[PDB]
Amino acid sequence: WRKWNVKVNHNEKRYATASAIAATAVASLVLARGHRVEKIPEIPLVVSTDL
Amino acid sequence: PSRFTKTRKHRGHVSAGKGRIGKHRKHPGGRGMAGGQHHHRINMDKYHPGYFGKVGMRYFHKQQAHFWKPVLNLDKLWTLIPEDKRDQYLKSASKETAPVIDTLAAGYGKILGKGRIPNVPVIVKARFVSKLAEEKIRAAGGVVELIA
Amino acid sequence: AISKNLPILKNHFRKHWQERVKVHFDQAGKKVSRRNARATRAAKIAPRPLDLLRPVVRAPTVKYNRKVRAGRGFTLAEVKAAGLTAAYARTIGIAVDHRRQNRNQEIFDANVQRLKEYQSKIIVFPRNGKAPEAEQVLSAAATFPIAQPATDVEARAVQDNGESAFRTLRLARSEKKFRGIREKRAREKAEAE
Amino acid sequence: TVKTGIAIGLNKGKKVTSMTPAPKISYKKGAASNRTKFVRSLVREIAGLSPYERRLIDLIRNSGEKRARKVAKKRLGSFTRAKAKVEEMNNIIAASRRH
RNA sequence: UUGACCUCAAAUCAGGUAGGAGUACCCGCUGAACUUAAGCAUAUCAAUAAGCGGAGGAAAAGAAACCAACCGGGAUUGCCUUAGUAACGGCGAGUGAAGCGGCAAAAGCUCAAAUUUGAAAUCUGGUACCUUCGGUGCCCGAGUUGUAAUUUGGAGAGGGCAACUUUGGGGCCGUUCCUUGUCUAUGUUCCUUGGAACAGGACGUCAUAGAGGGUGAGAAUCCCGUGUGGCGAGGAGUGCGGUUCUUUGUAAAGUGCCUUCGAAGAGUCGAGUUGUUUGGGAAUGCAGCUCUAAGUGGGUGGUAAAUUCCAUCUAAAGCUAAAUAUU
RNA sequence: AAACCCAUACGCGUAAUGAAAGUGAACGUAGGUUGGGGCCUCGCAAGAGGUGCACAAUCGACCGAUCCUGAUGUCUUCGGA
RNA sequence: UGAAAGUGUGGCCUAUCGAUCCUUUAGUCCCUCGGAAUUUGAGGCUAGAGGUGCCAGAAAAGUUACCACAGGGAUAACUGGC
Ligand SMILES: [Mg+2]
Ligand SMILES: [Mg+2]
Ligand SMILES: [Mg+2]
Ligand SMILES: [Mg+2]
Ligand SMILES: [Mg+2]
Ligand SMILES: [Mg+2]
Ligand SMILES: [Mg+2]
Ligand SMILES: [Mg+2]
Ligand SMILES: [Mg+2]
Ligand SMILES: [Mg+2]
Ligand SMILES: [Mg+2]
Ligand SMILES: [Mg+2]
Ligand SMILES: [Mg+2]
Ligand SMILES: [Mg+2]
Ligand SMILES: [Mg+2]
Ligand SMILES: [Mg+2]
Ligand SMILES: [Mg+2]
Ligand SMILES: [Mg+2]
Ligand SMILES: [Mg+2]
Ligand SMILES: [Mg+2]
Ligand SMILES: [Mg+2]
Ligand SMILES: [Mg+2]
Ligand SMILES: [Mg+2]
Ligand SMILES: [Mg+2]
Ligand SMILES: [Mg+2]
């Protein structure tokens, strides 16, 4: 009966997810994770729905 | 969590912040509320005046639904109308088209007169009201029709 | 043990509570089990909607009487008026409650219309043959949602007659309070000679 | 039992047109029946009275119905039961005077 | 004298049944103290541990002698809440539910009390046969001190009128479930190190398979497997999906109107007292003793009593899955 | 057992006060006085004046309880301005 | 009370006394008994009394040389020290 799971407010969850999505369209932050996108022309990287 | 706790910092120090003379002991003043009329009396009188004794009249089998009477002050009283039609009704300050506000369906049992609705007519359906609230409503030009 | 300015706490842990602590780790798995059970039941009653038609009914307790609610069963008079018997209805997906009684014509006729809608919306396969495949849904409650009745309109004229509606409540309260005294006084008046 | 339309008073509540449902047969449960009257009347003949009923007959003849009701409230439990039993005993007295 | 009945017995009589183990969870009985109260006696610990009896895969409870006071709800269980609240309490320490509301899950019913009386229509057993979780025939027997049909209060029954509507059981092949088997890709190519390559580097392949394990060191591609689908086997089964044979049935069930009726549980309810218990407070339940009912009656309506009303149920008999618990 | 989505309720809060029955928060630019950061105006500046959130002190007003007073009126004992 | 001014809310001043809970009385004759009423009864509001002298207020007799435990040099029975 230790506390194992934590409540996080729904809107804080959504704030964080939106921030993490916005950080995807920043080549400075993607390189800083070590993702090897130096030769990638530009991000957000969008490909066709044929995939 | 455990690493931001002063227990980690007391490591090396003998008493763990509890003293050498006082010697953290099990329950030196008692368990719980022991001593309220005794050695904890000053605290119970300084910070809990009224703790000891019984005052009034008992109620056997009290149901907290006979006493359900949530109060709405006049100052709001248009929050019960949606934003879509509120401006309409406020600029068309007219009888023959006055808005109806069932406060019970919104979840209120009594209307009170805290302050200053505008001079627009309004029909207010309420189980209970106050003297001043109804005075202000019919001075604005409305009417309180009671319901159950 | 009593100390600096803090609220008096009533924490009821002076019994052997650690022997009785249920931690609901089973929340997710038990949800999975409920979903699997609903699926199995639906497959077993593969055309049927997994829930009986329940009536619309008015809640007790003046706190809650402003709200209408789903009830248990359709009040034998209601189904008789709907034009079918209780035994047949129970085999057709209609909950019947023999112990509730109709005192309100609005609720009565609303539930009767509910039953007529259900009878028009269902198809009942014969006991003999075909079984004409019919695309079950899983809820009769979603197909017949409980709607709150519209008691009034959104705008009306102002009809003020000068009764003040606070003195009204006041006088109702006062006559309730002093009813018996006045009846006793009238009795003592009538028994004068 | 008609309501007024307001939230306090004698007949407080909302006005709704009523229906008067059919009478439940489980409201006439203690209702007497001819078979049952016959059976009980017959059994009272052959079984007769009990000691405390005999005592009630005597107290009603001599000391009146008030002490009879007191004694019957003690021997039985309740005042209303005592009243009913004393009335039964008065009927018995009249019938035995006729017989 | 003979033959019955009643009650009681004996049989290594014919057939069966109980015991003990386990006991996490479940139904009960019994029942502490340490401890807390800064002492201690009520209290608390706790209606707990220990002790005893008794079950199943769940048990129990359960179709209201309920909750309510509402425009009323409507078996039981469980969760969220109500609520650390109403209330109990050397009113101290402490204890402490319930109605409503939201949800999971949902399912309803059956006996007694009625003359079959123009037909004990009912049933165990034995025995012959058969298609054997049983059936048919025959024969003793049980049983009228009441076995079947009929009805269970939501109703319902006996007559009278009037028309309509609906039905049972076997086989076969599938599907559902259980268990199990089997088949279903791609490198062991080159160099270095090393005892060993599963390491490093080069070139490649498969991928709905780069989960995991093994193999002389970190292996998707060496092996088992994994993933995706396929092909079988054996059962249980009435859940349904089709096909086939029997026609159940001059039977049963349902519905409308009139009329006469409408049986409804007793050493129980209830009361007094004692003890225990409960939040239950002039007495919540339980038990013991004493007293002991009624039938337009009785219970309940959380302040004892009398009077007048109202509301709501229908006890003293009974069965029932699911949601729930599980060291 | 994650992550994502959601209805209706429920909890706290938006109203207190009285044992309770119960009543229930604007005389006023939501008050006045004193002081108050910051802003504005004049001033080269010094400073003067205006406005003055928060906060503090104080006098008032409003709601409830208590103690009074007790109008129009009336089931003549209710009502309570 | 005094002509009056004025004095007087116990004793010329400094001491002469007492919570909760319970009971009881007085007052308002007011509130509640929660399905609705009447009358009893009971419970509530406000002010006192019944008392705790260990006097901020447990309900309380001894012994142990048969003794026990936690401790104390905060504290005795030796030396020593002043
Ligand atoms: Mg410290
Ligand atoms: Mg230490
Ligand atoms: Mg200390
Ligand atoms: Mg010390
Ligand atoms: Mg102690
Ligand atoms: Mg101690
Ligand atoms: Mg002790
Ligand atoms: Mg045990
Ligand atoms: Mg069971
Ligand atoms: Mg049972
Ligand atoms: Mg709370
Ligand atoms: Mg307890
Ligand atoms: Mg007792
Ligand atoms: Mg016991
Ligand atoms: Mg008792
Ligand atoms: Mg001010
Ligand atoms: Mg004076
Ligand atoms: Mg003096
Ligand atoms: Mg005193
Ligand atoms: Mg008192
Ligand atoms: Mg002292
Ligand atoms: Mg001793
Ligand atoms: Mg000694
Ligand atoms: Mg001695
Ligand atoms: Mg010393």
mmCIF file of C-alpha atoms (C1' of nucleotides) in Angstrom, chain D residues 44 53 56-57 60 65 68-69 72 76 79-95, chain E residues 294-295:
data_model
loop_
_atom_site.group_PDB
_atom_site.id
_atom_site.type_symbol
_atom_site.label_atom_id
_atom_site.label_comp_id
_atom_site.label_asym_id
_atom_site.label_seq_id
_atom_site.Cartn_x
_atom_site.Cartn_y
_atom_site.Cartn_z
ATOM 1 C CA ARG D 44 -64.229 -20.575 20.377
ATOM 2 C CA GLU D 53 -60.391 -14.219 29.822
ATOM 3 C CA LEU D 56 -61.771 -10.403 32.569
ATOM 4 C CA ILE D 57 -65.390 -11.594 32.572
ATOM 5 C CA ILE D 60 -66.231 -6.654 33.910
ATOM 6 C CA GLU D 65 -64.167 -2.026 32.387
ATOM 7 C CA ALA D 68 -60.390 -4.806 33.182
ATOM 8 C CA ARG D 69 -58.442 -2.801 30.609
ATOM 9 C CA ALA D 72 -55.602 -6.797 30.066
ATOM 10 C CA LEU D 76 -51.323 -8.788 27.128
ATOM 11 C CA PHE D 79 -53.565 -0.823 25.414
ATOM 12 C CA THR D 80 -55.211 -1.224 22.003
ATOM 13 C CA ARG D 81 -55.068 -5.012 22.295
ATOM 14 C CA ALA D 82 -56.579 -4.703 25.772
ATOM 15 C CA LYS D 83 -59.384 -2.539 24.375
ATOM 16 C CA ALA D 84 -60.174 -5.035 21.629
ATOM 17 C CA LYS D 85 -60.125 -7.937 24.077
ATOM 18 C CA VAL D 86 -62.406 -6.184 26.563
ATOM 19 C CA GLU D 87 -64.856 -5.493 23.743
ATOM 20 C CA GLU D 88 -64.686 -9.173 22.758
ATOM 21 C CA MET D 89 -65.442 -10.048 26.382
ATOM 22 C CA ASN D 90 -68.420 -7.686 26.516
ATOM 23 C CA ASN D 91 -69.842 -9.318 23.396
ATOM 24 C CA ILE D 92 -69.259 -12.700 25.052
ATOM 25 C CA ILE D 93 -71.120 -11.499 28.150
ATOM 26 C CA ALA D 94 -74.115 -10.344 26.116
ATOM 27 C CA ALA D 95 -74.205 -13.596 24.137
ATOM 28 C "C1'" A E 294 -55.642 -9.946 16.238
ATOM 29 C "C1'" G E 295 -58.082 -9.996 11.367
#
